[PDB]
Ligand binder design. Structure first.
Ligand SMILES: *[C@@H]1O[C@H](CO)[C@@H](O[C@@H]2O[C@H](CO)[C@@H](O[C@@H]3O[C@H](CO[C@H]4O[C@H](CO)[C@@H](O)[C@H](O)[C@@H]4O)[C@@H](O)[C@H](O[C@H]4O[C@H](CO)[C@@H](O)[C@H](O)[C@@H]4O)[C@@H]3O)[C@H](O)[C@H]2NC(C)=O)[C@H](O)[C@H]1NC(C)=O
Ligand SMILES: *[C@@H]1O[C@H](CO)[C@@H](O)[C@H](O)[C@H]1NC(C)=O
Ligand SMILES: *[C@@H]1O[C@H](CO)[C@@H](O)[C@H](O)[C@H]1NC(C)=O
Lengths: 53, 186, 156, 54
């Protein structure tokens, strides 16, 4: 089964949903649907520490 | 602002044990060692040891092994030191201190006095100027508060620190012309 | 263990003048040495680290130096609030060790003792200088006014 | 090993939770362990970070 269940992870001070032209979803840029590409917000990438019980 | 709050003064019978506390505030509790230092009135400063709170790692001076035990409450942000099998040798002022980061000492506590109930006998001592006296004898424990005419006479008074055998005396000098709360005595 | 030797138990200086306390490690501590000031009845306060470095909030009067195993705390322009005991510490390796401490004293104008006796027989030797002078004795810290020690000897 | 038989050595690497914890223990910010013999070797790099409270 590929059944996927979403969960919000509490990410802080980073940009989410990074994408690329190498992975194009439709006309525009994109990325693997089940992955979330995190990067910097402005001048920092705060260390990222998160839990999922 | 970084603050290390130690516990109240302590009096203990020989052979008992005591737990002194150091409460850390104003910095992340887990990011720094806590140090313990002993001061007796004539031995200067001795290093007892340190404890790193998160993982509870304790590092002792070889000389205190078995005498002292550190512990840490990570929820109350508190470090405890326990002294056991107390002797008079362990009577001193105990400080806790926090390093600037990993080594030298930056922040100190206000200190905890540890000493290891009888009423005083107070006697008058009669002799350009003249010197008079008062003798407070056989009082346990400290402290004792001794004033002349209830504080009126200030300059000329010498009140000497106790000598344990606690016996203190005081002299009050004047011109030719002119309370022990532990036992509930005055 | 490493011994930190402060050979001066007492120093004499006058206000505005310059004073140096020496501390000698008994084997290499490199430059990791700190200097702390303990005033009467207060807790130790931090003066110097890395042997030469001024801790924040510390007046420019206090300067540390080091040559080999010799460490020196130098105060220039001694003020009256500078009356205290001075400890050095090697934090280089465990166990951490301290110096004996050096009490800074402000001297001047010597003097004779004023003696008064009382019948337990008490004796008071009052307001003299220098400090050196079934029995029980007690001394007092330097007098904050005229800079003179006093003492009480009880003979029971 | 000067003995007649094989020796089994069990060793380990410590992964601290915070960088502070790393330095408070080891000084250097990045530790490392290389355990080796004549014909083989292991180099482990410890990694600072958080793991579930245990
Ligand atoms: C990176 O992110 C993680 C996740 O947030 C952080 O890790 C957490 O650290 C905290 C702080 O210590 C942990 O909190 C402690 O959890 C303990 C575990 O008990 C658990 O299990 C019981 C049974 O299921 C549950 O009821 C309970 O809720 C927990 O799930 C507790 O025992 C601790 O309680 C103790 O202290 C508190 C006060 O803080 C007292 O009130 C209690 O009486 C008791 O003595 C405490 O609550 C938490 O577990 C950690 N999460 C995980 C899963 O690892 C990292 O700290 C963070 N890293 C950094 C440094 O930023
Ligand atoms: C997300 O994490 C931040 C930083 O640790 C925390 O302050 C906040 O409470 C969290 N937000 C939510 C809504 O869980
Ligand atoms: C640690 O401190 C917490 C918070 O004050 C307290 O509730 C707990 O009982 C303490 N743990 C012990 C038993 O020392």
């Amino acid at each position: 089964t590929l059944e996927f269940i979403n969960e919000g992870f509490n990410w802080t001070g980073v940009t989410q949903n990074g994408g690329s032209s190498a992975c194009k979803r439709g006309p525009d840029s994109g990325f693997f649907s089940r992955l979330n590409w995190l990067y910097k917000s402005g001048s920092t990438y705060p260390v990222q520490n998160v839990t999922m019980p | 602002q970084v603050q290390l709050q130690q516990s109240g003064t302590e009096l203990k019978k020989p052979g008992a044990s005591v737990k002194i506390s150091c409460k850390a505030t104003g910095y992340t509790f887990s990011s720094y060692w806590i140090e313990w230092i002993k001061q007796r009135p004539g031995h200067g400063l001795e290093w007892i040891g340190e404890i790193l709170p998160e993982i509870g790692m304790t590092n002792y001076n070889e000389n205190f092994k078995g005498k002292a035990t550190f512990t840490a409450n990570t929820s109350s942000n508190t470090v405890y030191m326990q002294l056991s099998s107390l002797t008079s040798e362990d009577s001193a002022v105990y400080y806790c201190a926090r390093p600037y980061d990993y080594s030298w000492f930056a922040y100190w506590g206000q200190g905890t006095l540890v000493t290891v109930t009888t009423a005083p006998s107070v006697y008058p001592l009669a002799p350009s100027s003249v010197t008079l006296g008062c003798l407070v004898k056989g009082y346990f424990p400290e402290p004792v508060t001794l004033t002349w005419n209830s504080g009126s006479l200030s300059s000329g008074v010498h009140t000497f620190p106790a000598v344990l055998q606690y016996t203190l005396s005081s002299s009050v000098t004047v011109t030719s012309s002119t309370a022990h709360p532990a036992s509930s005595t005055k | 263990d490493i011994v930190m030797t402060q050979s001066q138990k007492f120093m004499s200086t006058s206000v505005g003048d310059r004073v140096s306390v020496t501390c000698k490690a008994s084997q290499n501590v490199d430059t990791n040495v700190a200097w702390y000031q303990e005033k009467p009845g207060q807790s130790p306060k931090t003066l110097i680290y890395s042997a030469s470095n001024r801790y924040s909030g510390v007046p420019d009067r206090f300067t540390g130096s080091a040559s080999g195993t010799d460490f020196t705390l130098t105060i220039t322009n001694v003020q009256s609030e500078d009356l205290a005991e001075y400890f050095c510490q090697q934090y280089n390796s465990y166990p951490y060790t301290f110096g004996g401490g050096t009490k800074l004293e402000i001297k001047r104008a010597d003097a004779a003792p004023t003696v008064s006796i009382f019948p337990s027989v008490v004796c008071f030797l009052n307001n003299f200088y220098p400090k050196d002078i079934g029995v029980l004795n007690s001394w007092t810290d330097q007098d904050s006014k005229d800079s003179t020690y006093s003492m009480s000897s009880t003979l029971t | 090993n000067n003995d007649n038989s094989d020796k089994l050595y069990i060793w380990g690497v410590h992964h601290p939770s915070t960088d502070k914890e790393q330095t408070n223990l080891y000084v250097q910010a990045s530790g490392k362990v290389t355990v080796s013999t004549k014909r083989s070797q292991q180099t482990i790099i410890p990694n600072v970070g958080s793991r579930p409270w245990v």
